[model samples]
Target: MEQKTLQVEGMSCQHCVKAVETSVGELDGVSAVHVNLEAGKVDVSFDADKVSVKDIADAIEDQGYDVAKIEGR
Candidate 1:
């Protein structure tokens, strides 16, 4: 099990929240996802063997949002 936080840009409303949560949650390895519009962050818990941080970031990015690493673990 592994957890990471992603900083996302251009999420200004509920639609953006649903877009990110739905996209990331659809990933097989992601067990849960929490999107905080106020903080511009998405907290993801996933299975490292089944997915990578890149995958998660890409999922969010696919929804027209920007993803950035938190730096360090």
Candidate 2:
């Protein structure tokens, strides 16, 4: 498994966190997703063979949030 931490913007509440989590967590091969509203980021563990870091970023974007950066890719 590969892990990536993504910086996100516009997340202000638990519902926002859940929205991003639910969206990204639904993707195949995503082992885990952790959204921190206070930190404005998400830590995701996924199968690199099944999904690319870009795909994960896109998933966050699809949920109407901005991905500022991806760390430890």
Candidate 3:
């Protein structure tokens, strides 16, 4: 499993949070998703072998948020 903290923009409410969380959580290898509305950050845990960081970012972007940065481990 790999973890990533992403700085995202344009998320303002629980609806936004849910949208991002659900979108990313539904991806192929995603195991977890945590969204911080106050900080505009999203933490994701996924299988790196099954999905790439770009794929995660794309998932968020698809939910209508902009990904500013991705810090991975």
Candidate 4:
């Protein structure tokens, strides 16, 4: 498994947290998703063999949030 931390924007409340979590969590190979509304970050644990970092960013984008940066590949 590979882990990535995304610096995200536009998350204001718990609903935003759930939205991102649910969207990214639905993707194949996603093992876990943690959204920190206060810190404006999303931590994701996934299978690199099944999904790429770009794919994870896209999932967050699909939820109407902007991914500012990504760490951990």
Q: Please identify model 3 stretches exceeding 4 Å from their true place.
A: none
| Model 3 root-mean-square deviation | 2.2
TM-score of 3: 0.73
The TM-scores, one per candidate, come to: 0.72, 0.73, 0.73, 0.73
24-65: candidate 2 lDDT, tens digit per residue:
777788888777746657777866888887887776666646
Error of 1 at 16 (Å): 2.3
* lDDT (tens digit, per residue) of candidate 1 on 1-73: 5877776565556575576667667778887776664566767776677988787777667764645654226
**Local accuracy of candidate 3 as per-residue lDDT tens digits, 1-73:** 7888777675556565577677677777887877774665777787788988788787667764646778876
Candidate 2 — which pairs collide? none
lDDT of model 4 at position 69: 68
Clashing pairs in 4: none
In model 2, where do residues sit more than 4 Å from their true spots?
A: 64-66
Instruction: Select the stronger candidate by lDDT from 1 and 3.
Output: 3
lDDT of 4 at 70: 77
Q: Score each candidate by Cα lDDT.
A: 0.67, 0.71, 0.71, 0.71
- Candidate 3: 10-residue stretch with minimal lDDT: 8-17
lDDT of 2: 0.71
lDDT of 3 at 21: 70
